[PDB]
Amino acid sequence: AEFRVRVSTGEAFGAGTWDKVSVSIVGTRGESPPLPLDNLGKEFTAGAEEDFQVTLPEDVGRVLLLRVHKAPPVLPLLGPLAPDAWFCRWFQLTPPRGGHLLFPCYQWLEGAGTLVLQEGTAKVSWADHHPVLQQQRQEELQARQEMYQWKAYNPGWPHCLDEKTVEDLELNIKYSTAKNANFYLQAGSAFAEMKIKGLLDRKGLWRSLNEMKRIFNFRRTPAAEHAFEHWQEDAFFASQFLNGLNPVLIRRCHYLPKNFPVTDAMVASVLGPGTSLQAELEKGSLFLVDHGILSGIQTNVINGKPQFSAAPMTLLYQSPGCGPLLPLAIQLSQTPGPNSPIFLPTDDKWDWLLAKTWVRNAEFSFHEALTHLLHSHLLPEVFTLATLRQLPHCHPLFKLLIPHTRYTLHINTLARELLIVPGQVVDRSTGIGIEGFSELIQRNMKQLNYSLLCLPEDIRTRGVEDIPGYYYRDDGMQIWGAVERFVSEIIGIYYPSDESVQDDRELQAWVREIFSKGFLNQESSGIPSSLETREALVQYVTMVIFTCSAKHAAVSAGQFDSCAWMPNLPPSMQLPPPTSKGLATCEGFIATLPPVNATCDVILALWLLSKEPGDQRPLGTYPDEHFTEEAPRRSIATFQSRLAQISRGIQERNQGLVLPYTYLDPPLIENSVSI
Numbered sequence: 001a002e003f004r005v006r007v008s009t010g011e012a013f014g015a016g017t018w019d020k021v022s023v024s025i026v027g028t029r030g031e032s033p034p035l036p037l038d039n040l041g042k043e044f045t046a047g048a049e050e051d052f053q054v055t056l057p058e059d060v061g062r063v064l065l066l067r068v069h070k071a072p073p074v075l076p077l078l079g080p081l082a083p084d085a086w087f088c089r090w091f092q093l094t095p096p097r098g099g100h101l102l103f104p105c106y107q108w109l110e111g112a113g114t115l116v117l118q119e120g121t122a123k124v125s126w127a128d129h130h131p132v133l134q135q136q137r138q139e140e141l142q143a144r145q146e147m148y149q150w151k152a153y154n155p156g157w158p159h160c161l162d163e164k165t166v167e168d169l170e171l172n173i174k175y176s177t178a179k180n181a182n183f184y185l186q187a188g189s190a191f192a193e194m195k196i197k198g199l200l201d202r203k204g205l206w207r208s209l210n211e212m213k214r215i216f217n218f219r220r221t222p223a224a225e226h227a228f229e230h231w232q233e234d235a236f237f238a239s240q241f242l243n244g245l246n247p248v249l250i251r252r253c254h255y256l257p258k259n260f261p262v263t264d265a266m267v268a269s270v271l272g273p274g275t276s277l278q279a280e281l282e283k284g285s286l287f288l289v290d291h292g293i294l295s296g297i298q299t300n301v302i303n304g305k306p307q308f309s310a311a312p313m314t315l316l317y318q319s320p321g322c323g324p325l326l327p328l329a330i331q332l333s334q335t336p337g338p339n340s341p342i343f344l345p346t347d348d349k350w351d352w353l354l355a356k357t358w359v360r361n362a363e364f365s366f367h368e369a370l371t372h373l374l375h376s377h378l379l380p381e382v383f384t385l386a387t388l389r390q391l392p393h394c395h396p397l398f399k400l401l402i403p404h405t406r407y408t409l410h411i412n413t414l415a416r417e418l419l420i421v422p423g424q425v426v427d428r429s430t431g432i433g434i435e436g437f438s439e440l441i442q443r444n445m446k447q448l449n450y451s452l453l454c455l456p457e458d459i460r461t462r463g464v465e466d467i468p469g470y471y472y473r474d475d476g477m478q479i480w481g482a483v484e485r486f487v488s489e490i491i492g493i494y495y496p497s498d499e500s501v502q503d504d505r506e507l508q509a510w511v512r513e514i515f516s517k518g519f520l521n522q523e524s525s526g527i528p529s530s531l532e533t534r535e536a537l538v539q540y541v542t543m544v545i546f547t548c549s550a551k552h553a554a555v556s557a558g559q560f561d562s563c564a565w566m567p568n569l570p571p572s573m574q575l576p577p578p579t580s581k582g583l584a585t586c587e588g589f590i591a592t593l594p595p596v597n598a599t600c601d602v603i604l605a606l607w608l609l610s611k612e613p614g615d616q617r618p619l620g621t622y623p624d625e626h627f628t629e630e631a632p633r634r635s636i637a638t639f640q641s642r643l644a645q646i647s648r649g650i651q652e653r654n655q656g657l658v659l660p661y662t663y664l665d666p667p668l669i670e671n672s673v674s675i
């Protein structure tokens with residue numbers, strides 16, 4: 001007859017509420033009326049965990065749902081006051097004579113809304129067949145699909161959330177006021193420094209390479225300083241293909257592309273007289289970085305001056321015995337010929353240095369448009385938006401995936417509002433501009449592939465499983481294994497067979513929506529449009545979580561470290577690539593680099609997008625307990641202690657490196673894409 005209702009309120013700003021809360025307990029035998037949760041003094045203060053003794057007029061049997069109503073106080077002859085938004089963490093019912101019932105919530109309640117909560121026990125559609133519970137699932141997803149809808153942003157792009165401004169978003173997918181404040185303070189302060197220094201308003205060349213060091217007065221990091229110390233070095237130019245900003249392109253080469261006519265004579269110096277180009281190709285010691293996708297891309301106008309982009313090809317040589325990876329040849333065009341020289345390290349100073357810089361510029365355009373924006377933001381959004389629409393609150397995958405979706409819809413809405421719009425940093429200060437970004441995404445979407453998204457398949461495909469000093473791989477694979485083991489445990493707990501995976505209609509709709517809205521129903525993407533086995537499910541889910549956390553962390557963390565010394569990552573180029581050799585000079589080199597304002601505007605932007613604003617949410621840390629059962633909680637503990645072991649391994653490893661790799665240290669990896 002009696003019931004103890006324990007309720008936890010959020011600690012966030014505004015989490016508390018002055019409004020009155022009432023609950024209706026629904027059971028197999030029936031539903032109770034609205035029951036008040038009103039004790040002496042104020043309840044539902046921010047961070048509060050309070051008990052309420054409630055009594056039901058009659059029996060309800062086994063508890064099924066928990067309907068939570070909220071209404072503002074009611075003055076006689078004045079009506080209600082005003083809605084006071086309330087964030088609820090969880091409910092807990094305790095009937096006689098014992099046995100607790102935990103109802104996880106973790107969402108905002110507003111106005112005359114009604115929160116319907118199931119017991120914390122995760123349940124697939126075929127888990128509990130009670131019609132009251134099936135009705136709850138169906139009506140919930142119906143509401144979700146109405147709340148969060150799709151729209152086409154551009155042709156050939158993945159679809160996105162149908163919201164124009166960040167203000168139109170629901171509270172449940174918004175930045176916390178804390179995180180947002182922290183973010184805008186950091187930005188306003190950063191912009192102020194760069195602005196008052198008059199650098200955002202300087203149209204023209206840097207007076208010298210030395211003046212470019214002024215960036216280190218704005219912001220400063222050891223890795224950024226290190227880039228300036230060694231940017232001219234070949235080993236550093238090459239190593240950044242492995243442990244730098246964009247470590248996903250390098251791949252082993254047994255057959256040199258015909259449009260890249262490197263001869264044995266061109267590489268005889270570096271390789272030595274002991275072998276030849278063909279011999280080393282067969283050895284598997286030669287690797288290639290091909291920015292061909294940039295070929296003929298649309299370019300931007302900066303300060304009324306037409307900008308330029310190359311689409312280079314870089315041949316690299318991995319010297320024996322853990323020696324350095326060294327560049328052999330660079331061609332700055334996809335079309336060979338006398339007007340596109342193959343530059344060697346044996347060329348003069350500025351020819352070779354100019355050639356390398358062009359490749360670094362290609363890395364920028366490629367990284368930010370495809371590796372960062374498309375792969376580490378747009379696809380995670382699709383995963384997020386599909387998850388919200390197709391997987392209900394009580395579904396195991398929702399419980400698993402929901403922390404890895406936090407703020408993703410928010411940050412992307414922000415980008416579409418303030419990043420890739422006219423007048424803003426991309427349009428303003430990048431070489432390829434808005435149309436270039438779009439054109440790249442459009443091309444890449446037509447040849448995307450499931451294997452690149454799954455790290456073990458990615459490393460295998462590119463044939464870089466054994467290349468030394470590849471820390472993005474080394475650390476990335478350990479984390480992937482950890483996530484894969486974590487996911488397989490969760491799947492093993494809830495899905496007893498492959499048939500049980502096939503019959504999950506909600507799961508199949510989830511994969512199908514990602515395939516449709518995310519990858520445009522392209523079979524050539526190699527991405528599943530359905531999941532027929534548990535093995536496939538484990539891999540797919542692992543790919544999602546990994547993409548939303550470590551992948552973004554790996555390609556985001558190094559942005560400022562890489563761009564702070566601008567010659568190491570020029571956002572644009574102001575002259576076309578050289579057509580002859582022996583023309584490059586220091587004066588010409590600076591004339592080719594972007595103007596001061598474009599330089600500092602991009603650096604300002606990348607510095608802000610490198611750091612996770614506000615409080616952190618480390619990978620594998622889930623303060624929101626959606627999983628209330630024991631078995632999933634063990635899996636979380638295992639996943640957490642493993643990440644710690646992986647971390648400690650990375651500390652030891654980095655301790656003996658002049659330039660450590662920290663971008664994949666688990667404590668520094670966010671659960672989701674949020675910046």
Ligand SMILES: CCCCCCCCOCCOCCOCCOCCO
Pocket residue numbers: 188189190192193
């Ligand atoms: C139109 C309104 C402009 C307001 C701009 C306010 C300036 C913001 O300053 C942030 C950057 O300044 C850095 C250092 O400022 C001095 C404080 O002391 C530094 C040592 O801790």
Ligand SMILES: CCCCCCCCOCCOCCOCCOCCO
Pocket residue numbers: 368372373377411412414415416418419425426430601602604605606608609675
């Ligand atoms: C001075 C400009 C500061 C930039 C603030 C806007 C940030 C909002 O969008 C963030 C999310 O972006 C996702 C993808 O990022 C790729 C952008 O690349 C940087 C271009 O310079």
Ligand SMILES: [Ca+2]
Pocket residue numbers: 014015016017084085086
């Ligand atoms: Ca409030």
Ligand SMILES: [Ca+2]
Pocket residue numbers: 038039040041042043
């Ligand atoms: Ca009270």
Ligand SMILES: [Fe+2]
Pocket residue numbers: 372376377552556609673675
């Ligand atoms: Fe990002």
